[PDB]
Structure 1
Amino acid sequence: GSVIKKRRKRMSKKKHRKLLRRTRVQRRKLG
């Protein structure tokens, strides 16, 4: 299989992890 699919999945995962890191304290305080 082409690595293009892995690249799309990894970019989605990386962006989501960045978003989670950017709002850790906000999530902790709202939950």
Structure 2
Amino acid sequence: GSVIKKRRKRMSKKKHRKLLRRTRVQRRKLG
């Protein structure tokens, strides 16, 4: 199939990973 779907999925996963990197310390302090 076309790689457009894979592009959407990788963008979503990348954004989630960046969010996790940004809030790692806050999650640890609240967890």
TM over 0.5: yes
Listed as ranges, the gaps of 5+ residues in structure 1 are none
TM-score between the two structures when normalised by the length of structure 2: 0.98
Any unmatched runs of 5+ in structure 2?
A: none
Q: Deviation string for 1:3-24 (max 9, x for gaps)?
A: 0000000000000000000000
How many matched pairs?
31
Indicate the RMSD between aligned Cα atoms, in angstroms. Answer: 0.2
